């Protein structure tokens, strides 16, 4: 990331990756406070996903994963267009989707 810069690295992985997974909620199988405040790649990754979606190409790569209930946000709704997998129950289906 330091060599390329996050944006170029993000795009490189986006094109290179066979599959892409978006996680929108924390796990429930283990209890945590969510802490363990700074700029992150989520907004940029969302913009690149929107570009791909408007291209309507490589839609198969994108997969949405959640454990706790997804929040009520527009970006998540946009990501909802991709296949969903509730790993609390959908472990095998998600594994098959990847394979």
């Amino acid at each position: 990331i330091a060599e390329m810069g996050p944006v170029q690295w993000l795009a490189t992985q986006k094109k290179a990756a066979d599959k892409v997974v978006f996680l929108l909620s924390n796990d429930v199988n283990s209890v945590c406070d969510g802490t363990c405040n700074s700029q992150d790649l989520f907004p940029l990754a969302f913009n690149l996903f929107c570009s791909d979606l408007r291209s309507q190409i490589h839609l198969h790569k994108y997969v949405v994963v959640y454990f706790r209930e997804i929040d009520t946000k527009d970006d998540y709704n946009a990501l909802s267009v991709c296949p969903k997998y509730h790993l609390m129950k959908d472990a095998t289906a998600f594994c098959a989707e990847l394979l």
Binding site: I1, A2, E3, M4, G5, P6, V7, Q8
Partner: protein, 227 residues
């Protein structure tokens, strides 16, 4: 490592010196700084010495640290033609021109390429400077609010990944709290608090500038003066 900074304020120079002392003592890292080699700068000149350091770092694959503050952005704007050329109180006694501006113009030719951003580490003391002070040139590269991410900075210097499959790498002494507890860390903390207090007391410090505990004896950076 080579530290590039704008001498925005004598207290800011104090902060930089404390940071260099911390790197030398607690981090075992050798620091190339203008204040420490004014003999070489006098012999060769700002541009000659700067070119030597830049070429040496690139050849040795060593990292160059950029300390961003209000002065750095002021000089960047001056280069872009949107501010009067900065004549800082601290650079007045140094050779012709400006060391930071010369260093930057020596850096920009590297940014024509898409992957030279590794050799530069962009850091700013969050308590006395804000992310808005980092030149737009370095936005493409990861930024580090110093001492809030310094452990990452030291990994960048050592060229080590902080995370790996199923395991994590940490440096005990350089961790935030351990940094605070470290001897040199206390000196850096005191200098930063002093500069922050001065900034709070004088909002227009930069315009005016424009024109403690003890380590074991002999272990830190020592300031000499004749009687």
């Amino acid at each position: 490592v080579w530290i590039i900074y704008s001498a925005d304020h004598p207290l800011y120079v104090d902060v930089v010196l404390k940071f260099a002392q911390f790197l030398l003592t607690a981090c075992g890292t050798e620091v190339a700084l203008d204040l420490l080699e004014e003999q070489a700068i006098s012999e060769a000149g700002v541009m000659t010495w700067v070119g030597r350091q830049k070429q040496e770092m690139v050849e040795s694959n060593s990292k160059i640290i950029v300390l961003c503050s209000r002065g750095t952005r002021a000089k960047w704007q001056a280069l872009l033609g949107r501010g009067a050329p900065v004549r800082l109180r601290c650079d007045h006694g140094k050779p012709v021109g400006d060391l930071f501006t010369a260093a930057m113009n020596m850096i920009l030719p590297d940014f024509k390429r898409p992957a030279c951003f590794g050799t530069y580490v962009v850091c700013y003391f969050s308590e006395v400077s804000c992310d808005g002070d980092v030149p737009d040139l370095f936005g493409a590269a990861p930024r580090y609010p110093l001492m809030d991410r310094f452990e990452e900075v030291y990994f960048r210097i050592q060229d080590l990944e902080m995370f790996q499959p199923g395991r994590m790498h940490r440096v005990g002494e350089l961790s935030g709290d351990n940094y605070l507890r470290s001897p040199g860390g206390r000196q850096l903390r005191a200098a930063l608090d002093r500069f922050r207090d001065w900034q709070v007391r004088c909002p227009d410090w930069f315009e005016c500038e424009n024109l403690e505990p003890l380590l074991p004896p002999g272990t830190g950076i020592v300031k000499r003066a004749p009687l």
